[PDB]
């Protein structure tokens, strides 16, 4: 279930973080413009940049802590507010996060592993709800 999926991802956070982030950018290439240093870079060039690895690891570590603090896939309002108030997210809208979650759930369904994809979809929906309540446009 969702708890085990958190353990799966955390066990190999590097690999899942890089693979899901790349899935997101591949599915929604226009999103790459927010990441000015990843423009024009192959997947291996990205994996060569210590800074890409560090970014993805920190994003997915935070995502897993938010997921783990959720109850029944309902995140804490305080965690949504962290995400809204981060300077790195200041021009984003909830549609950016929706797309992130569509890509993550599609990755899980395509992986041929037994992720609880329905629960990640619901967590994403509830997180998007919470982001909007905490002031994201
Ligand atoms: C729930 C999903 C997300 C989480 C948990 C998250 C978390 C984070 C964290 C922890 C950082 C800072 C990492 C560091 O200091 O190395 C970060 C940076 C950033 N995030 Fe997010 N983020 C999420 C979704 C998004 C989305 C959807 C976008 C845009 C489409 C985005 C754009 C950025 C940008 C541009 C940075 C700064 C990147 C850089 O330094 O090159 N984030 N995010």
CATH number of the domain residue 116 falls in: 1.10.490.10
Q: Are 9 and 56 in contact (CB under 8 A)?
A: no
How many Cβ atoms sit within 10 Å of the Cβ of residue 121? Answer: 18
Tokens of 110: 């395509």
How were these coordinates obtained? Answer: X-ray
Report the C-alpha gap between 12 and 55 in whole angstroms: 15
Query: Into how many domains does the chain fold?
Result: 1
Q: Which of 116, 3, 121, 133 is nearest to 79 (CA)?
A: 133
| 99 marked ligand binding residue | no
**Resolution of the solved structure (Å):** 1.2
Q: How far apart are CA 23 and CA 126, in angstroms?
A: 21
- The span from the CA of 64 to the CA of 11, in Å, is 11
Q: How far is the CA of 59 from the centre of ligand 1 (A)?
A: 6
Neighbouring CB atoms inside 10 A of 126's CB total 16
Q: Helix axis angle, 94-110 relative to 117-133, nearest 10°? A: 170
| CB of 53 closer than 8 Å to CB of 41 | no
Domain that residue 128 falls in: 1-137
């Amino acid at each position: 279930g969702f708890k085990q999926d958190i353990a799966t991802i955390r066990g190999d956070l590097r690999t899942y973080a890089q693979d899901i982030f790349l899935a997101f950018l591949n599915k929604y290439p226009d999103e790459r413009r927010y990441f000015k240093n990843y423009v024009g870079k192959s997947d291996q060039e990205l994996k060569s940049m210590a800074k890409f690895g560090d970014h993805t690891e920190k994003v997915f570590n935070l995502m897993m802590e938010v997921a783990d603090r959720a109850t029944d896939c309902v995140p804490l309002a305080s965690d949504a507010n962290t995400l809204v108030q981060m300077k790195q997210h200041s021009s984003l809208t909830t549609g950016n996060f929706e797309k992130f979650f569509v890509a993550l759930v599609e990755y899980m369904r395509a992986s041929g592993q037994s992720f609880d994809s329905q629960s990640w979809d619901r967590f994403g929906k509830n997180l998007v709800s919470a982001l909007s309540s905490a002031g994201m446009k």
